[PDB]
Design a protein around this ligand. Structure first.
Ligand SMILES: [Mg+2]
Ligand SMILES: [Mg+2]
Ligand SMILES: [Mg+2]
Ligand SMILES: [Mg+2]
Ligand SMILES: [Mg+2]
Ligand SMILES: [Mg+2]
Ligand SMILES: [Mg+2]
Ligand SMILES: [Mg+2]
Ligand SMILES: [Mg+2]
Ligand SMILES: [Mg+2]
Ligand SMILES: [Mg+2]
Ligand SMILES: [Mg+2]
Ligand SMILES: [Mg+2]
Ligand SMILES: [Mg+2]
Ligand SMILES: [Mg+2]
Ligand SMILES: [Mg+2]
Ligand SMILES: [Mg+2]
Ligand SMILES: [Mg+2]
Ligand SMILES: [Mg+2]
Ligand SMILES: [Mg+2]
Ligand SMILES: [Mg+2]
Ligand SMILES: [Mg+2]
Ligand SMILES: [Mg+2]
Ligand SMILES: [Mg+2]
Ligand SMILES: [Mg+2]
Ligand SMILES: [Mg+2]
Ligand SMILES: [Mg+2]
Ligand SMILES: [Mg+2]
Ligand SMILES: [Mg+2]
Ligand SMILES: [Mg+2]
Ligand SMILES: [Mg+2]
Ligand SMILES: [Mg+2]
Ligand SMILES: [Mg+2]
Ligand SMILES: [Mg+2]
Ligand SMILES: [Mg+2]
Ligand SMILES: [Mg+2]
Ligand SMILES: [Mg+2]
Ligand SMILES: [Mg+2]
Ligand SMILES: [Mg+2]
Ligand SMILES: [Mg+2]
Ligand SMILES: [Mg+2]
Ligand SMILES: [Mg+2]
Ligand SMILES: [Mg+2]
Ligand SMILES: [Mg+2]
Ligand SMILES: [Mg+2]
Ligand SMILES: [Mg+2]
Ligand SMILES: [Mg+2]
Ligand SMILES: [Mg+2]
Ligand SMILES: [Mg+2]
Ligand SMILES: [Mg+2]
Ligand SMILES: [Mg+2]
Ligand SMILES: [Mg+2]
Ligand SMILES: [Mg+2]
Ligand SMILES: [Mg+2]
Ligand SMILES: [Mg+2]
Ligand SMILES: [Mg+2]
Ligand SMILES: [Mg+2]
Ligand SMILES: [Mg+2]
Ligand SMILES: [Mg+2]
Ligand SMILES: [Mg+2]
Ligand SMILES: [Mg+2]
Ligand SMILES: [Mg+2]
Ligand SMILES: [Mg+2]
Ligand SMILES: [Mg+2]
Ligand SMILES: [Mg+2]
Ligand SMILES: [Mg+2]
Ligand SMILES: [Mg+2]
Lengths: 271, 46, 94
RNA sequence: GCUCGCCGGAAGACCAAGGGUUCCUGUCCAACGUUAAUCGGGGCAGGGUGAGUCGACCCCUAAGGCGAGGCCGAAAGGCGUAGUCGAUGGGAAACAGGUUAAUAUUCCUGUACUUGGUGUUACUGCGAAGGGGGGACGGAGAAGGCUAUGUUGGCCGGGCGACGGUUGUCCCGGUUUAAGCGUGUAGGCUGGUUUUCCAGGCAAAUCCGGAAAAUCAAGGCUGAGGCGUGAUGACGAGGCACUACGGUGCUGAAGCAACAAAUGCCCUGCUUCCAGGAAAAGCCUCUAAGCAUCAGGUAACAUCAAAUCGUACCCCAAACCGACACAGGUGGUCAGGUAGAGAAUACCAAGGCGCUUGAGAGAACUCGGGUGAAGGAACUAGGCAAAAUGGUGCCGUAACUUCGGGAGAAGGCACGCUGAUAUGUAGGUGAGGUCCCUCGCGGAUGGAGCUGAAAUCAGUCGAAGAUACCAGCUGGCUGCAACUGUUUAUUAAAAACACAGCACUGUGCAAACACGAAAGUGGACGUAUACGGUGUGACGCCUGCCCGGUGCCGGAAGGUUAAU
RNA sequence: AGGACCGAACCGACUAAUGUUGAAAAAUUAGCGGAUGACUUGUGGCUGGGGGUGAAAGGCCAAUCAAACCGGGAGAUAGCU
């Protein structure tokens, strides 16, 4: 439920919260946590590789089952939890033999439902089965690219991938970007759209709310000196040049994909 | 005002001390230069 | 058992002082200048054998040497170690 | 020595960092000290730092560093696994009193505590590099219970007043006491217990996790403070004595209650929010190989051990960083009275100072202030600077608006003291007494005593009652930027940058991109509701025409065209 | 509840005066802004010079920055003084 905030102060004027009352109001499950130390966008050389990353609230990492290998054993869903590590909410599930794991929460999943992986699983939102067992034309998420590698496609808060075709060893997918990609028919996928679909309806409202998420401010390139950026300089506002990166690569329109290994897997590009 | 030398013995020895010089190759060449010049205090280290 | 040869090298000198004269008559504690690497057990073993007297406890402290100037040349005296050796009651020592 | 003045959320006290003998005593006055100096942080000599509990070391890890092999690289070397380092965080335990010229939670007196050794005695499943638990964690807010501490009364000791009065509802001073041990309270959390079973916890497991069934609602965990003990002690105003006038010795009364009360404690709580809040060991537990009456295990008692290093002194400063005995800078802890919302501010206590040139004179001029006739911005680039406003309560408050604001708009009234209501009210606190009780740190009832606003009425004083310090000038029009924020350390704080938003574009994951000869790493333990780049810059209404040029994207028939 | 309000600590530096061989190689005095947050601070770490870092002033990188410092080529070169 989106909640428009009342304008008691500027900085609360434009805030829309996304309030989900079903999330667990307690501590997360302690065995599945581990330390997630921040980086600041800096590699092992100490240099800033990717800009604008730094600060933000401390975040513990939640070990999430993407591989989803407990086949045959049914699992009931204990509660839904908030995950700071990702945009989608996660679900704490309890198998029959007593193991607890975290999965990505699908759209219609709530506390108390039963999920089950494996080939003999039913087709309800939550089950995970190889895509030679999933009917053509259904919406799945948490899709593997390689069998047993773990789900890599359609993991962000409201995404999903449709299965449009199958020719023997491959299935053809309609990715969320609109790209048509071939994936082997033995890769696991999880039924239904992924949960937190109204995540994109939030508006942060103030500058500090982006600093809470560890997003340092972005200085636009024309506000610099020519030693700093190709856009920099000028006596006033001058931009008489084609828009490039800080490293002189065209940005408005120039393609950058240079992977000739995976070109056989791409049916059509995005539009 | 706050001036540029704010001393700390721990930071003085980790940065300029004896074992910090002997750790790397160029730091060992620093101690070879000071021995060739004949320094009384070969490093920072007390 | 501390070896008998080391126990002869532990003790250096008695320390004469106003505080040493006070501790001998009130707390019954002698003040000794000891070797610098000597520990408390080595002092207690040395005083109980070389002076033939019963030691209750030994407290030690290291005296840092002063910086003096002979003429105009700077210099530093040696660090030495000081022991407050409390004898048991009834025991007496010169 | 007596006065005077100054600080007193510090200009007092305790440390860390840093310094390194500046500490204490004797002695010296050349140099050093912005003067003299008998003095000194100066010279010279001597003295001074005492730990099983404080701290370090040590056990443990964070960021990070190093890194066997390894991978990579002309060489140097780079990265990194197992590991091993690395506190600023986790990990056993001591308090009170006394004492030195100088140290004390270290010495002494008193009373404790912890962890290891060995050794007997009783007891017998022990065992890890493994499993589990615990350690173990955010911001904000709300009270409640307390204590530190203060005030008043009582109590004890002293006093009866240089000048009117002062045997009293008078004045002065004291009224202190710990860790530990016992009690388990306010209060917080929690359903217990037994059996059966179990694709989980890499194997195992009695443990944890999960299924059952049965039974009991009441056990457990945490917990400030209080009370008791510690304590017939210690401390204690004063006296009594000697006096090197510094002191030293001796003796010692009362040692209670009420009320107020923290930013400290319960509280690592509770409530709530989204931005979703270290790790590892100690500690607890489970078994694996192993061990089989041995080892080990816990239990009592006895005994032994607890090393080494630091401990002086300054530490918002004359001792540290500033070349100086430099209006600078410097993290933590302690937080008395009166007024006050207050850690503001005024004056004070404890405590510490008067800032290492003075003495006169009382010109111009400069510096920092005070007041000013009449006028009141005529000054000026410009009300720069000054002056003015200033508190609380109540009344009242416009355009406009995103309905929150504007707004403390503006403007005005009241304000002291005394008495009465009421010898102190409403309220707070809550004793005896009585009742009840699973009996206690219990529950009612009960109101003594203490504390105590605020208001009305009456009176009264001054020129003036928010009387000092303290403490908004206000309104009208308009440019720009939405805002809070940011910036040229040291002439520019702005309309510049950032910003939420918006859009374009790239990017299918071994992602684009970036740092790297490379290995790799960041992006990201993320996956197109994601990430990078670029422009614009909340919000409202909107964003028109041009693809010739320059880019970019798509095309592949022809022309042209490299090595070969 | 709040990048909410008033206001000390604390952080900052808008205006004026002083000072300009200063008390001070940027400070004092009287005002001033922020003051639960994009806050501030201790300790330790990491990024290195055509490199870092930069809410972007060509700012900052040890009183030095349109390419730091130190040593070396080195007695660079100087139709100039
Ligand atoms: Mg960015
Ligand atoms: Mg942006
Ligand atoms: Mg920007
Ligand atoms: Mg610019
Ligand atoms: Mg350029
Ligand atoms: Mg122009
Ligand atoms: Mg033009
Ligand atoms: Mg002792
Ligand atoms: Mg010692
Ligand atoms: Mg000296
Ligand atoms: Mg002295
Ligand atoms: Mg002297
Ligand atoms: Mg003289
Ligand atoms: Mg002189
Ligand atoms: Mg001296
Ligand atoms: Mg300790
Ligand atoms: Mg490491
Ligand atoms: Mg090697
Ligand atoms: Mg390495
Ligand atoms: Mg270690
Ligand atoms: Mg520490
Ligand atoms: Mg520690
Ligand atoms: Mg002292
Ligand atoms: Mg463990
Ligand atoms: Mg908190
Ligand atoms: Mg009390
Ligand atoms: Mg009189
Ligand atoms: Mg009289
Ligand atoms: Mg009295
Ligand atoms: Mg007690
Ligand atoms: Mg001391
Ligand atoms: Mg002081
Ligand atoms: Mg000073
Ligand atoms: Mg002076
Ligand atoms: Mg006060
Ligand atoms: Mg004050
Ligand atoms: Mg002076
Ligand atoms: Mg005059
Ligand atoms: Mg005036
Ligand atoms: Mg006038
Ligand atoms: Mg007059
Ligand atoms: Mg007049
Ligand atoms: Mg005029
Ligand atoms: Mg004029
Ligand atoms: Mg003015
Ligand atoms: Mg004024
Ligand atoms: Mg105009
Ligand atoms: Mg602005
Ligand atoms: Mg502002
Ligand atoms: Mg400036
Ligand atoms: Mg300025
Ligand atoms: Mg990678
Ligand atoms: Mg712009
Ligand atoms: Mg246009
Ligand atoms: Mg065109
Ligand atoms: Mg065209
Ligand atoms: Mg083309
Ligand atoms: Mg605010
Ligand atoms: Mg600044
Ligand atoms: Mg000021
Ligand atoms: Mg304020
Ligand atoms: Mg410029
Ligand atoms: Mg500089
Ligand atoms: Mg350079
Ligand atoms: Mg150059
Ligand atoms: Mg040459
Ligand atoms: Mg030359």
């Amino acid at each position: 439920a989106v909640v428009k905030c009342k304008p008691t102060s500027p900085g609360r004027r434009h805030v829309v919260k996304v309030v989900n009352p079903e999330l667990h109001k307690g501590k997360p499950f302690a065995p599945l946590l581990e330390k997630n130390s921040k980086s600041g966008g800096r590699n092992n050389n100490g240099r800033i590789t990717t800009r604008h990353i730094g600060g933000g609230h401390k975040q513990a990492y939640r070990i999430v089952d993407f591989k989803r290998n407990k086949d045959g054993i049914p699992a009931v869903v204990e509660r839904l939890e908030y995950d700071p590590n990702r945009s989608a909410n996660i679900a704490l599930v309890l198998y029959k033999d007593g193991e607890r794991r975290y999965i990505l929460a699908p759209k219609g999943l709530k506390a108390g439902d039963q999920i089950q992986s494996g080939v003999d699983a039913a087709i309800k939102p939550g089950n995970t089965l190889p895509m030679r067992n999933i009917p053509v034309g259904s919406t799945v998420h948490n899709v593997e690219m390689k069998p047993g590698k773990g789900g890599q496609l359609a993991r962000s808060a409201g995404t999903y991938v449709q299965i449009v075709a199958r020719d023997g060893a491959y299935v053809t997918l309609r990715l969320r970007s609109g790209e048509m990609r071939k994936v082997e028919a033995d890769c696991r996928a999880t039924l239904g759209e992924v949960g937190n679909a109204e995540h994109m309806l939030r508006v942060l409202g103030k500058a500090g709310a982006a600093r809470w998420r560890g997003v340092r401010p972005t200085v636009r390139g024309t506000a610099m000196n020519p030693v700093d950026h190709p856009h920099g300089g000028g006596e006033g506002r001058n931009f008489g040049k084609h828009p490039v990166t800080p490293w002189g690569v065209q940005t408005k329109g120039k393609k950058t994909r240079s992977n000739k290994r995976t070109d056989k897997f791409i049916v059509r590009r995005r539009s | 005002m706050k001036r540029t030398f704010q001393p700390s013995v721990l930071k003085r020895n980790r940065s300029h001390g004896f074992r910090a010089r002997m750790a790397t190759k160029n730091g060992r060449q620093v101690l070879a230069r000071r021995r060739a010049k004949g320094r009384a205090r070969l490093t920072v280290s007390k | 058992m501390i070896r008998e040869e080391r126990l002869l090298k532990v003790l250096r000198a008695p320390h004469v002082s106003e505080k040493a004269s006070t501790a001998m008559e009130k707390s019954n504690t002698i003040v000794l200048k000891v070797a610098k690497d000597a520990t408390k057990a080595e002092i207690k073993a040395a005083v109980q054998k070389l002076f033939e007297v019963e030691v209750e406890v030994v407290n030690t402290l290291v005296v840092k040497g002063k910086v003096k100037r002979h003429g105009q040349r700077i210099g530093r005296r040696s660090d030495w170690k000081k022991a407050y050796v409390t004898l048991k009651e009834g025991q007496n020592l010169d």
